[PDB]
Amino acid sequence: IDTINMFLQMTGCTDSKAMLYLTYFEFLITFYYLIATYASIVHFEQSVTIQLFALLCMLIECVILLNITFRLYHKNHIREMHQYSRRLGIPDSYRSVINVITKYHLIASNIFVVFPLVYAISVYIAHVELCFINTTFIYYVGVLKHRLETIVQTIGEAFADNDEQKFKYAIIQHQKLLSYFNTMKIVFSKPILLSMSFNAIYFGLTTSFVIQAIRGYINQAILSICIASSAAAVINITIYTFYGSELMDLHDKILHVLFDNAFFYVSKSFKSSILIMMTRVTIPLKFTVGYIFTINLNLLLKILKMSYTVLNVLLSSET
């Protein structure tokens, strides 16, 4: 909750009033930089190394502008989803991974700051929201996993006393978990698409800039951006894919814990509920966004295969 409370405070679910306007104040500072950068090549005269660096700057600030209100859009959804998540925590492994991510992002940000204030304004604001969406997703997937574990434990307890009331409670818990998963899909459908497109376009930009690098046009130039932003894109897309694929194995636990010998001693009303929930949980929890994208390691492998094919084609054409 070190940064989950930060989610809450900049989103507005808490008593923070000026901090909410401070979030919108961040939307204006980037807006100042975005319009100024867009006017560089339009009016100002500069060399090739400037606009391309400005293009990386404006593309980065485009993400910054396309993340603040982009995340503030689902204010009520995030509030309700946090309220559901307040009851039960998250696994210790998820706590460790979010701690590691938030420690790395803060430390890695300072590397570029002191690498060589006028330009450092946007350096720190970029890194915080890069970790921000990479921590919210893991926290709110971990709470879902913990609730799934609680549901499995409740079902296992229900298969010891033939308790209709306990099984009804477990079914209600499963329905609430499904509703929360739908809410999570609604919340995260858009930022995941933004991150995936960002990854694709920066992969293309970096591979073109890397093949046109050794020639020497980029001495003390965009290479720092093409390293840092590409690394951030890679880590966020990897986190998203991994924790969207972890949700594909949540229903298997229920599907395997429902198959119990006690099912042959219940009173013919327990059996119908068992069979109905088995039918429901046969299909795993699929994280479908954009009507075409299934967020998982298979999607990550597809992206990697596309990148590898592009690299192979470019290398074959060059040689």
Binding site: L178, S272, I276, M277, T279, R280
Partner: protein, 406 residues
């Protein structure tokens, strides 16, 4: 007219007035009227096919360079969509009649009549909005095609008869389509007649090629709205079966409501099957032509440069060819999603505190409504947004490959 016919009356009237080979849904079934309508439709078909034959004639007899050949093939394949759809609706009216007659005597249950009426109104609104969008797009396309003729120099590359490998730019009449004519079209009455004929041909062919897709999209929209209504009434349907402090009246009411829900879902499934049967070969032919269209258009965009008539032509052709695919791809994907979500809607109700009949009904619904209803295109591919995404990715990859190899 009641049911889907009254639901789609503007579409039916538009296709009737266009000149397509449709015979039913009349009110003046007399010999003279049927003779006049048959004569008008045959004249329209003859005019359209003669103009198309002239267009393809001005593709091999006057095109020498590869660029001119590509432009001619692009135009011919662009109008091949309308050419195929015209004959398909000419020789396939029975499937359309069967599809339109599926919802003939269906009547909502008295308990869920209000919900059915609300979803019917929503379906009407969606259908009208889609028709308005289609009409606006067709009108804008025709207007732009008419306008762009006068923004360029009508010069055709022709080899010099005196030299060996030298060409000039012979003047050509300013016409919307490069077509050959038995009579001269350089100036005067011939020029005006040719321009009028080409304008009418473009408008009517676009009207047919858009009306077919509009009909398919309207069918899918109605199916989706019916499925949404079925999902919506499931919670009150199950709550009817609660054992709160079962009488014979309650039991018979629950049985009747379950029967009505099952009959409506079976009607939806059969309607989607009829949609697949009626619009399989159309989608197959459309995609087969559009594959070549997009390949040649990507090749043309490879040589694009600056802003000019050629750039605008390539951009417009690409945009229209992608929009035509997307128009039915989005509706196929929406139908797949709405058919797959019925299981979640059924499982998300208060069925645990219900009767054994309600639990059995929920179990059977969860069992069947597991794999989504798919409008397969001639059982070759699955019409959804996956197909459109794959097409866009393939086109972008081909464009990148060409721009790298050139």
């Amino acid at each position: 007219k009641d049911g889907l016919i009254k639901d789609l009356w503007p579409n039916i009237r538009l296709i009737q007035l266009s000149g397509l080979f449709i015979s039913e849904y009349y009110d003046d079934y007399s010999g003279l009227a049927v003779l006049f309508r048959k004569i008008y439709s045959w004249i329209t078909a003859i005019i359209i096919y003669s103009q198309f034959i002239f267009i393809v004639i001005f593709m091999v007899t006057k095109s020498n360079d590869s660029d001119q050949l590509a432009a001619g093939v692009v135009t011919t394949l662009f109008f091949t969509h309308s050419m195929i759809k015209f004959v398909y609706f000419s020789t396939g009216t029975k499937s359309f009649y069967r599809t339109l007659s599926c919802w003939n005597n269906t009547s909502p249950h008295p308990l869920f009549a209000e919900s059915h009426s609300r979803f019917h109104a929503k379906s009407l609104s969606r259908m009208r909005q889609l028709l308005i969008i289609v009409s606006i797009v067709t009108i804008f396309t025709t207007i732009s095609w008419t306008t762009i003729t006068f923004f360029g120099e009508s010069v055709w590359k022709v080899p010099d008869p005196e030299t060996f490998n030298q060409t000039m730019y012979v003047p050509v009449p300013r016409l919307m389509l490069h077509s050959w004519y038995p009579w001269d079209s350089g100036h005067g009455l011939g020029y005006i007649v040719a321009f009028v004929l080409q304008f009418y041909w473009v408008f009517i062919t676009l009207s047919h090629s858009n009306l077919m897709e509009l009909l398919f999209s309207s069918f899918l929209v109605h199916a989706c709205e019916q499925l949404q209504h079925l999902k919506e009434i499931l919670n009150p349907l199950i709550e009817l079966s609660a054992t709160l402090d079962l009488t014979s009246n309650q039991e018979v009411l629950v049985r009747s409501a379950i029967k009505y829900w099952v009959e409506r879902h079976k009607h939806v499934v059969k309607y989607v099957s009829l949609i697949t049967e009626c619009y399989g070969s159309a989608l197959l032919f459309h995609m087969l032509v559009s594959t070549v269209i997009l390949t040649i258009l990507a090749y043309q965009a490879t040589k694009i440069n600056g802003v000019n008539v050629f750039a605008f032509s390539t951009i417009g052709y690409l945009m229209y060819s992608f929009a035509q695919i997307f128009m039915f791809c989005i509706h196929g994907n929406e139908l797949i999603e709405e058919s797959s979500s019925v299981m979640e809607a059924a499982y998300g109700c208060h069925w645990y505190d219900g009767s054994e009949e309600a639990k059995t009904f929920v179990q059977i619904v969860c069992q069947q409504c597991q794999k989504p209803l798919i409008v397969s295109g001639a059982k070759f591919f699955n019409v959804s947004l996956d197909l459109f995404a794959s097409v866009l990715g393939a086109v972008v990859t081909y464009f990148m490959v060409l721009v790298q190899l050139k």
